[model samples]
Target: EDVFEVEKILDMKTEGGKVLYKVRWKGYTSDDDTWEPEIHLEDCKEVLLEFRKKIAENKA
Candidate 1:
């Protein structure tokens, strides 16, 4: 399993149009470690579509 999962979608109408989606795994329960947000893009269209579909489904 992975420690983290993340995705992002950009809205062309806005500056810095970079959307971010993140899925944090169940770990890193310590004070000396932390996880940075991952930006999902670049040949990750399937994941992006999945995220987009989720958004659409929610809206309806």
Candidate 2:
């Protein structure tokens, strides 16, 4: 069996100004628990700007 836990945050931020979110998954077995962190920038202007700048720099 498998179990999944998802967490969503509208305003997730770090102390250093880094934005992040999390998603956790769990399994029935003894070693089947995991945590996943996700970054959402669709609504974050700062993060989106940073991402865009990084992409531009990489392309150049």
Candidate 3:
């Protein structure tokens, strides 16, 4: 994909005090999902917010 887009943020993990999100790129299959660092997703604020909201709701 020349210019990929984020389809969803499926999961998150913290390693070495940094946050990573499991990103599913648009038009890609599950096998393409990757763990992306917070900085790498800096341009994805709203998408991350929705993910965090979902997590919070699930935790509650």
Candidate 4:
């Protein structure tokens, strides 16, 4: 698709120490949600940057 909206962030999980974001793609339900790595979500840069920063600060 050419565009997508972020309905919500479902979870942030670590597998093998790689952080993953499970995002609820807008206009979709739990059945449509997907897990994506940061690099693949450049379209949502601003929000991702903020979320990543928040997580970083909380990672103490």
The per-model lDDT (C-alpha) reads 0.44, 0.39, 0.89, 0.75
Which candidate ranks first by lDDT, i.e. highest? 3
- Runs in model 1 lying further than 4 Å from the true structure: 1-40
Error of 1 at 24 (Å): 5.4
Order by lDDT, highest first: 3, 4, 1, 2
Per-residue lDDT over 1-60 for candidate 2, one digit per residue giving the tens place of the 0 to 100 score: 442433222223355555453222232443442322343324444644554476568779
Off by over 4 Å in 2: 1-43
lDDT digits (tens) for residues 1-60 of candidate 1: 643533333221222654444432244333423323234344466755775687788789
Global lDDT for candidate 4? 0.75
Return the lDDT, model 4, position 40. Answer: 64
Model 4 CA RMSD to the hidden true structure, in angstroms: 3.2
Q: What residue runs in model 4 are displaced by over 4 Å at the alpha carbon?
A: 1-5, 49-60
Better of 1 and 2 by lDDT: 1
Q: Please give the clash total of every predicted structure, in order.
A: 1, 0, 0, 0
TM-score, candidate 4, is 0.59
